[PDB]
Design a protein around this ligand. Sequence first.
Ligand code: A1ABH
Length: 284
Amino acid sequence: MEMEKEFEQIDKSGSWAAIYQDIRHEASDFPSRVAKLPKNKNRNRYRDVSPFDHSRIKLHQEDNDYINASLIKMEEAQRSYILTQGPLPNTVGHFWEMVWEQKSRGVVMLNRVMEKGSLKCAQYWPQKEEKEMIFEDTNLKLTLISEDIKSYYTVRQLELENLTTQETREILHFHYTTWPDFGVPESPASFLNFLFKVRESGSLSPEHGPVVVHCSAGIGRSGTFCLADTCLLLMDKRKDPSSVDIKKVLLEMRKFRMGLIQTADQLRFSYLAVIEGAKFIMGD
Ligand SMILES: O=C1N[C@@H](c2c(F)cccc2Cl)Nc2ccccc21
C-alpha cells in the first residue's frame, strides 16, 4: 500500500498512537546482560536504554570492552550504522576509541549539549583550533581544523591522532542544531537537506567504517535519521518503490537496538520525511 495513502488514512482517522503501540508490542526482545553488570553502571546514561548483547560494539581492550553502542546492519539496503548515546564525562575517551577502532569517517549529532535547561551530553570535541583535547585513558588527541556554521546545521573537520602509533585521520562532525526542545520539526525540509549533506560527504559509503549516530539516548532522533536513509535507499534499488513498508523496516532495525522511534509524533515525522524525500529519489 503506497505509504502516502496509508499516511492520509492514519491522519484522517487520527490512529498514530494505535499504530505506534502495535510496533512496541511486536518489537524484538533480546538479552542485555553485559550492559546491566555493576562495573558498567556509570557507562549508561539511562537505566532503561541498553544495547543487546548480540549486536553491541566491543572496545578493543582487555580491561572492560563495554560501551552503550549497537551495530545496525541493513542487509538488503547494504548500509551499516552505529547508534550510541551522547557521551558521558567518563565515556568521552571510549567514544573516540570506538570511532578509531571501527574506522568511521563521520559522526552525526542530532542534539544540543544543553536542552530544556539540563545537560544532554558532554562537550566531547574542541571549540577552538589552538586548544586541542587529549584523552589520557585511551591515548588519543583531537584537534579542531575548521568549522562551517549554517542556519540549520554546522560541519567541522576534526583531526584524530592515535598517540600510540602517530597515525592521524580526518573525521567530519555533522551537527544538526535546530531540532526543537519539544515535539518534532513542522517541515522535514531542513532534516532531508542535512541527510543529503552527510551522504554527499562519503560518510555513509562502504569504503569507510559505519557512521556513528547519536542524540541523548541514541534511539529517538537517531532512529529517525537511519529509518529515513534506509527507506529512501530501498525505494532507489527496488523495481516497485511502493513495496517499501516503513513499519517493517523499523521492526527489522529494532532487532539490533531497542526503542528506535520514541513517540507517535516521531513515527509520523519519519513517514513525512520519506514521502517528501521520495519526490527527489524518483527523478526530480
Ligand atoms: O559541507 C561541508 N563543509 C566542509 C567544511 C567543514 F567541515 C569545516 C569548515 C569548512 C568547510 Cl568548507 N567539509 C565537508 C566535507 C565533506 C562534505 C561536506 C563538507
